[PDB]
């Protein structure tokens, strides 16, 4: 069974991509270093060569040293350890790694190329390294020591230091200062009167340096002589200042500690290594019992607590990307899950430790996906029965009579949350006969909380028998004099004549009484209305203005609300596979008027504001809304005017299954036709590179193909470095699609400027390589006429350019009846560009040699006589 999977890795390296191949060997190591001592080391050589193929040098070095461990006969292990130590920055070990491999096999040019680059590398490396130490020391003296100009010189000095670590791994080694950046950084966050931009840039340098492994792991060890106290401080670093963005960026230093102890995706799709996890399990129990223990700590703050909850969903779901199985269940088997339930009960009114209203999202989702990482067999049941025994622990203890009302609101708020996350167990609990009467008992009490949450409970239940109970109580509670209960109940009318909307308009149009959660439910109800309400909303201006202002005004829970607000009015979501035709609200020009007013009222800043949630399906909805804003007369300027694309690519990195593709086609429709230094200026042009890739991954059949071509048509019009960035992702399979299937497409004129310009090393090796004969032939056949003005010119320009090559002029003598049709369709045809485009193409064809100069004779003369007049 060992060999039967060992073959599949190397086959997977060459079948399509190595991105899938690297994990195959990683699965194949499960019986290694036990059942056999022959297969395990060589599979370690192949796996380390596999991650070396990607961009992971740390694991490749620590597996190449694992396979050298048996005898050191592996030569590819030495070439790989030296290739890793080359990019590692420490080229000294790479050189002695490579001299001991080239001495074993004197042949093979690559072993020589490594030593060739290493000679100059070690040669200059001491000079550049002492210059890097004077730059590191001059930088530390400026940003954090006695320096002038107050904020201005410091906030810039570190700003150069972050790039001194960020774009150079060798400079990343020198900014960390062998283990000295940390005390300076944490000494900065300790200043209560420090500008927070300085604090966030400092930590940003901090996580950058520890991105690797040991530099991060020493960041745990250095703080206390004994380990558990030393991981506490790293965890408890968010409990230092907590300004606004300080907590989000002090969170990633803790996130980075997960990436070290088990090696993880960081962003791009890479699986953790069990081999490191089992070694570092001691660290992971220590940090996760520390995050669990600080999850209920009263001293722990509001937002830093829910960022502490973000770390769990992002790390312990082994069916997504995190600690492997057996640790996902170590969390449920003890207090880790029972205590995890408790925080979902607490609400901004009843808590005991600070809790935010936003907590909702962060507490729903990590339970829901905990149902996704419990997709074993005894997992489903141990999870459910832990929740059922907690629910039984709460009903028997609530005694909603003698000041036990707090227990009844606690169980109610615990149940309202799980209808937002794990519905499979949440409806499983509202089966109980004790539930409905207690719900009713809160419904009529003078305790204003119990009634509000009461209407919130059944509006959460909106997807069987308890459902018919709660609706009548909802409408009888709608009349309530208090806004919290009327606004909390109006959602449930929409959740089942548009009479309610005339009150929904005044609910948010008057920004006086309603502010915090009051406006929030006022929008949530608005989201549940659809069908023809669209135009009735569009013909009011204060509706869009007040919805945008409400989303700008702390729209943290305004997520799915706005995302379904602008999506349903115009946008359409595709689904797997009479009434609409008569609709004058979402079908014809009214769909254009809806986005036309929606954008000019200012929906974009509300979108970038409410996108900060990790809600995958709300990410898909905001992506669909964003592409729906695009493809209109002046909308192309409107997207960039606030930053639609800049967060569109931000949502491409993490979205739902179709959310990445909706984001990708969204960026394509958004730009393209604007300008090359507008659709991705400066440092952002490279970020737009990746989304264009995997946009040809499916098939060239729908409207998603033509946009994917048209945006790349302008992606390479400026600067060569971008054209060389495109080559490293290999666009060849993509162009192969429209080479032999698309009929009505301008993509040929883009492929011309692609193959012609680009990097010299690539495009010279691409215009020539592979059977290009039919490519040259279609370069001539379509340049004749073909009822198109541009095809005849852009097709001809590559004829005039390629004619200049020496190897290329032998192959032109394969087709001769193609030249009468292009030489005639230049003087006789009515087009203007094709005449100058064709005459210059003919002259270079008659200037290469005399063998073809007589084969045409008259086809050229028909143009030469026409030119003189």
Numbering used by the authors: 7 to 469, 475 to 507, 525 to 557, 560 to 607, 622 to 913
Task: Recite the paper's sentences.
A major player in this process is the UCS (UNC-45/Cro1/She4p) protein UNC-45, a myosin chaperone critical for the assembly of thick filaments. Specifically, UNC-45 was shown to promote the folding of the motor domain of myosin molecules. In this process, UNC-45 acts as a co-chaperone together with the general chaperones Hsp70 and Hsp908,11,12.
While extensive crystallization trials of the UCS domain containing various KR mutations were not successful, we succeeded in crystallizing the wild-type UNC-45 protein in a crystal form, capturing the UCS domain in a distinct state. The corresponding structure of UNC-45717 (the number reflects the shortened crystallographic c-axis, when compared to the previously reported form, UNC-4581511) was determined at 3.8 Å resolution and exhibited a similar domain organization as UNC-45815: the chaperone adopts a V-shaped structure with the myosin-binding UCS domain opposing the core region constituted by the TPR, central, and neck domains. Like UNC-45815, the UNC-45717 molecule formed protein filaments in the crystal lattice using the same 4-helix interface to connect molecules. However, a pronounced structural change was seen in the UCS domain, a right-handed superhelix that was bent to different degrees reflecting two distinct conformational states. Structural alignment of the two states revealed a bipartite organization of the UCS domain. Its N-terminal (ARM repeats 10–12) and C-terminal (ARM repeats 14–17) halves are connected by the irregular ARM repeat 13, the hinge of the domain. The disrupted interfaces between ARM repeats 12/13 and 13/14 appear to provide the conformational flexibility to allow for a 15° rotation of the C-terminal portion, a gross rearrangement resulting in a 10 Å shift of the C-terminal ARM repeat. Although the N-terminal UCS half is held in position by the underlying central domain, B-factor values increase abruptly from ARM repeat 14, the first segment of the C-terminal UCS subdomain. Together, the crystallographic data underline the structural flexibility of the UCS domain, which can adopt discrete conformations. Strikingly, mapping the KRcanyon mutations on the structure showed that the corresponding lysine residues cluster in a well-defined region of the UCS domain, contributing directly to the interface of the N-terminal and C-terminal subdomains.
